[PDB]
Symmetry: C5
């Protein structure tokens, strides 16, 4: 799946690519599970090699945040929920070269879907590939913060269910939900931590136009402010787990009596 | 619910609003669950847009501590107990513009109720919107410190139930109380942490008249001194949980024998 | 209960107060659960308002470490054991004004009893209210260190018990007693640490007093880790015990 | 087992040692469980004392990262899996002296096996003992990162077994404990390489090309350690949830 | 028990003290559970008061690391195993005055036993009391590191026993061994931490001849490198404890069925 976008008055407008062959006019090329026809098309029409599937698995800093003849590379976890509502992180390879942004990804993602919807009726400021990359990160953080907000409200309700060792079988259900909330929070943290590394790298490495530099710092500031929330949820979750076992053992005693 | 206050010899005096239409004379407008008639009234009589309900859910720094054409915005958790005696945090949007303070909130709050009572017979120092905002934070901290104090004394009594009782009935009750104290402390910490960010932002961002600056630092100093107490309670609570499970298992053994 | 002390060759000597009315000669006024007659006596004979009972409950820095028209105020937890041998902290309001120290407290305390015993037959150095306040803190830390030392030796014996029966109920109970002592010792230390940090930045402290304060801060820094180390051991012991209890449960069911 | 390597256009080429006696031409001598005949051969043909077996057990900084008349010494944990698929760390003594690298080890290791494969058809940059040492550390980190990646995917599958019987649960706890252990041993390996590289940066004149290489490895380690810590949280939480399910099950049974 | 040592070509040589009365020639006096005859002998022949038994119990910095008319005092935990193979720490009072070292101890200790054995055929460098004190600390650290090394190998074997979660007999034994390894590690950490304070004090306080200063820093560096190992063992130990309880509960279920 190949989509391309060009700029018109600092407004991202969707290029037709099946028909309007010239890719050279695009500021952003976005690939989702691209076949070899699409890869080769980018290779020949632009200068651009793209990362292979196993290179997106690499978690080492030097494999994710690096500069080379193919441009500036940032690989970053993006958060998603699979078909059975199980949280996950999907690595996206960002590449910036000659003022063009390339995003290579394994699947559809809610941040991208959201940014694209907004980009349809919303002006960029400086109108460049670095701004675009950060806009996508802004969007990511916005969603991560929404995830955390919902862990709180779900955990609040679940908390009240757990305050009785009244078991059968709203308690099997409670432990399961706890474990689902732990896992979401855990994966949100990985996503935040990784974006944090990515942005710290960017700040030291890319000439970032100054409007872009402040934007990046703003996102870093948001991340610094979300991480503690994440850590706070783990305490609560772990305590709730402990209390539940207490109630289960109290119940066991009742039963044996 | 719209209340408005004006200043008379550095004394907040309650300006009648059903009758005395001119809002322009107020230093402080306080909204509680305001209907669209009240919102629009503030919009037209002053310049003032107010934050929407879902914008108060946002926990990201950049959504809580920011400056824009509508003025200086500080969103801050305030602590309360709901109708069924469950602790909670309620976000209050503070907005300062052209020397006037706007507080927008979802519900009655004990800090506000308390500050208003006092403000009926008590002089402000410099008599301005920044002082007023900090006075409300001072009051918040005063109450948070009282909460912590009471967690201590409650935990002290509960501690003795957990060493001296072995009935199954007074022990369900004990675990429940433990969990109620854990939750209060947890929510107090969130409240403190958030006020801390808010005040750090204020110190760097607002021209704060120097009398206000020292006031803010005093509040910051109080917070630095309350956070460790919070953390100390969690250790005790967790240890008590562990001891209880030990006693429950010792009891189980007695029963089976 | 009102006691007063005056200085004689840098030696604290106990003033008779039922009889020798002039309080003005005292360097140190010590109140224990004082009635309104004693409070008013301090109010009129010296300039001195004293903190009220509910103000000693306040834990907020700004309510404990502050300066005002009534002088320099330091509120600080002191460690004690109640009638049933249960550990506790009692807040003591220290107030320094015009070279005189005021201590207001809710109860008798071992640090004070100990300092008073010694102060009979022991010379102060610079002989002033700031030294006196720090001398009381020195004594407090001395006793806190003793408490920790004993948690160690008690925990050592208890450790061996934990490696069917009636002696295990007893073990868990003792563990929980030792946890609580250590916990309350830490609160006491942490609070004295804030108090001394405040003092260092705030009071003109005569230089002899400044080094004294730093010495106490250094002691606290060296005791806090011990406290934390005990919690690890205590928590681990608790865990092992539950393991043994479950192993026992399995033996029984078989 | 004695292997020796010399340089030819910045390409490590394997010296024949059974036959081509002169060791003096080697840039890298690599010893695996060397007998006293091999040790003595290094002692006499080069100046080189080698660390004894019990000196590789020593974990103290001053026993692992030090300089003396015998040269520059770096002892470092390398990660491996034994015959029964159990994770382990094996200390390797690196020694650099008069532009020559000596590696002394107790066993075959996957990092070395991998670096040697690659070195057969791959050019070094500056072509020296310090680069060589760092190349081996680079390779080590590459493999540690792969381990962590696999702990994640295994833990993901195991997570679902624990949410979704008595038989498949013994097995689950055992797997959990295998993953904890791997992560634990990876951390020890990372931490130790980190000390080693910090020491190197302050101590050896490191040619500037080497210096950046070392910092790159340090940067990778900084980025892998948090992953390690993150796994321990998940593992510990999974352990707790399992006990919860086991106790719920116990209650069902007793009823 | 009084032993005394003098220097001969930077070689500690054991003075005969029953017979060769002059103690003034010694660089090192070493007391083990000394009676009042030996204490008084040191008091009169040298200037030297020695710390009393209850003064070695004091753990407060100011009671362990201090200077006074009696010289330079360093009290330090040394590690040992008692008659019933239980790990322990024994405080040793080091005192340096007029170029002479005094060590006062409650019992035989493996570091001292080891240093003395080596000192019989090994030259000191600068040949002074400060070097001697540090040599003893070097030896201590050497042994602590050996302890940690052995905790690792014992914990490795024990780890494999605990994955066979089956028999009731080899499991009592396993928990016991775990608890014995936890305790050793715990006491090793106390020993390390205390030596660390002692050496930090020494570095700021004693004129330390420069050869001695580097020696001290080397020991500090070793300690900094051993502490993390200690902390790592606690995580493993705690995790193993948890897994064991899991296997015990699985077994309990099997039994009840
Ligand atoms: Mg949101
Ligand atoms: Mg636990
Ligand atoms: Mg059970
Ligand atoms: Mg209060
Ligand atoms: Mg003492
Ligand atoms: Mg050794
Ligand atoms: Mg790889």
């Amino acid at each position: 799946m190949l989509s391309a976008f060009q700029l018109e008055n600092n407004r991202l407008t969707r290029l037709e690519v099946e028909e309007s062959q010239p890719l050279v006019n695009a500021v952003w090329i976005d690939l989702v599970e691209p076949d070899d026809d699409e890869r080769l098309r980018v290779q020949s029409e632009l200068g651009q090699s793209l990362a292979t599937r196993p290179e997106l698995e690499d978690i080492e800093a030097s494999a994710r945040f690096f500069e080379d003849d193919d441009g500036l590379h940032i690989h970053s976890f993006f958060f998603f929920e699979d078909a059975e509502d199980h949280a996950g992180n999907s690595t996206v390879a960002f590449t910036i070269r000659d003022g063009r942004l390339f995003t290579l990804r394994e699947r559809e993602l809610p941040a991208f879907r959201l940014y694209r919807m907004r980009a349809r009726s919303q002006s960029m400021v400086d109108g460049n590939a670095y701004e675009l990359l950060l806009d996508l990160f802004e969007t990511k953080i916005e969603q991560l913060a929404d995830e955390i907000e919902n862990i709180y409200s779900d955990l609040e309700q679940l908390s009240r269910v757990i305050m009785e060792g009244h078991q059968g079988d709203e308690y099997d259900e409670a432990l399961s939900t706890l474990a689902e909330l732990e896992d979401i929070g855990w994966k949100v943290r990985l996503c935040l931590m990784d974006t944090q590394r990515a942005l710290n790298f960017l700040v030291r490495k890319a000439r970032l136009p100054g409007g872009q530099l402040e934007q990046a710092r703003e996102i870093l500031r948001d991340i610094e402010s979300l991480l503690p929330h994440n850590e706070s949820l783990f305490q609560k979750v772990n305590f709730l787990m402990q209390a539940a076992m207490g109630f289960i053992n109290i119940e066991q005693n009742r039963i044996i009596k």
